[PDB]
């Protein structure tokens, strides 16, 4: 599903942004955007019935699949 | 470009946006995902003009920044 795939990819890329935030590599507006997006992902998670952790894993493999041969 | 939390944030944002664009190119995402993509692209153009950083250059730097950390 394009909606499910969108969620998985959004979750994984958000996970990357969160990790960079916790590493202190980024500034405050990036951190504000981060927390905004997370609240939005939680809302979407309720509608899709997909756990953010599971979606994050799936999104990692989707991204691995696309960067593998293109880059 | 300089290496500050603000420029790193911009590099990461540009590169991760690029990955979302690749999903759009594959046609594997829904209309809200594409809506967010266009809205974020406009945001990045403003921050690009503000920071005086080329999006293409920031996109490459973001790739290597993420790659350095994830690998």
UniProtKB/TrEMBL annotation, chain B:
Protein origin, superkingdom: Viruses
Subcellular location: Host nucleus; Host cytoplasm
Description of how the protein assembles with itself and partners: Homodimer. Interacts with host TRIM25 (via coiled coil); this interaction specifically inhibits TRIM25 multimerization and TRIM25-mediated RIGI CARD ubiquitination. Interacts with human EIF2AK2/PKR, CPSF4, IVNS1ABP and PABPN1.
Family statement drawn from the similarity comment of this UniProt entry: Belongs to the influenza A viruses NS1 family.
Record text about domains: The dsRNA-binding region is required for suppression of RNA silencing.
Role of this protein: Inhibits post-transcriptional processing of cellular pre-mRNA, by binding and inhibiting two cellular proteins that are required for the 3'-end processing of cellular pre-mRNAs: the 30 kDa cleavage and polyadenylation specificity factor/CPSF4 and the poly(A)-binding protein 2/PABPN1. In turn, unprocessed 3' end pre-mRNAs accumulate in the host nucleus and are no longer exported to the cytoplasm. Cellular protein synthesis is thereby shut off very early after virus infection.
Protein name: Non-structural protein 1
Gene that produces this protein: NS1
Full-protein interval shown: 1 to 71 of 221
